[PDB]
Amino acid sequence: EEIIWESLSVDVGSQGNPGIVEYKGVDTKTGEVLFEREPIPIGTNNMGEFLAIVHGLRYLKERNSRKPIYSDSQTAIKWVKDKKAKSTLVRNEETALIWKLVDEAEEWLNTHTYETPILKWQTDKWGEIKADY
RNA sequence: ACAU
DNA sequence: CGATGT
Ligand SMILES: [Ca+2]
Ligand SMILES: [K+]
Ligand SMILES: [K+]
Ligand SMILES: [K+]
């Protein structure tokens, strides 16, 4: 319905898909950049969006924050809910780094708890997510 | 078809 | 136009 302004928004950016992947998280209200991941040489859009959400969960938990997370990614929201990133990206030396991060993100989800609502940013109604690149 |  | 996903 309406934007929950007291929230964290995440977004992925890439050069190619697959290609160089980065992500960041911002304060939805203020646009302040709260975290930014160093570019990962090869990944997919959906792996990046998944890592961004899980990073947000870890960031908020560390700070004892109950704010929700917005993502515009139907895919990544489901992967987090399932605790399983069903990526099609081949596993090889080129993709080892992103797959390590994805494996570790799944492992974190399987060993920690959180109440953080993970909410769909409604781009069609609200425009671009505030974490946009 | 929808979300990127 | 190409790719990643449910
Ligand atoms: Ca974006
Ligand atoms: K996005
Ligand atoms: K983006
Ligand atoms: K498609």
Distance CA A33, CA A107 (A): 26
Assign 3-state DSSP to chain A and report helix, strand, coil percentages, each to 5. 35, 25, 40
Distance of alpha carbon A79 from alpha carbon A45, whole angstroms:
13
For the CA of A75, the nearest ligand: 2
CA A114 to the chain's CA centroid? 15
Q: Residue A80 class from Cβ within 10 Å (0-12 exposed, 13-18 middle, 19+ buried)?
A: buried
- Residue A115: how many other CB atoms lie within 10 Å: 8
Half-sphere exposure of A92 (CA within 13 A, CB side): 6
Does a cis peptide bond (omega within 30 degrees of 0) precede residue A39?
A: no
* A81 CA – C5 C1', rounded, Å: 15
HEC per residue, A40-96: EEEECHHHHHHHHHHHHHHHHHHCCCCCCEEECCHHHHHHHHHCCCCCCCCCCCCCH
List of residues 6+ apart from A19 with CB closer than 8 A: A42, A43
Q: Which helix (H) or strand (E) holds A13?
A: strand A8-16
Asked if A50 contacts A79 with a C-beta cutoff of 8 angstroms, the reply is yes
Which tokens go with A122? 């409604």
Tell me the C-alpha distance between A57 and A73, whole Å: 15
Instruction: Provide the resolution (angstroms).
Output: 1.4
> CATH topology for A1-133?
Nucleotidyltransferase; domain 5 (3.30.420)
Structure tokens at A44: 């997919």
Chain B positions under 7 Å from a protein CB?
2-4
- Give residues whose Cβ lies within 5 Å of ion ligand 1: A 11, 132
Whole-angstrom Cα distance, residue A109 to residue A58?
9
Cα angle for residues A53, A59, A62 (degrees, 5° grid): 140
Domain residue ranges of chain A, discontinuous segments joined by +? 1-133
Residue nearest to nucleotide C5 (CA to C1'): A75
Q: How far is CA A22 from the centre of its chain?
A: 10
Q: Which residues touch strand C (CB under 7 A)?
A: A 17-18, 44-47, 74-75, 78-79, 86-89
Please answer whether residues A40 and A20 qualify as being in contact, where contact means their C-beta atoms are separated by less than 8 angstroms: yes
Report d(CA A53, CA A130) in Å as an integer.
14
Cβ burial A88-101 (10 Å sphere, 16+ → b, else e): ebeeeeebeebbeb
> Looking at chain A, how many residues does it have?
133
Q: How far is the CA of A72 from the centre of ligand 3 (A)?
A: 9
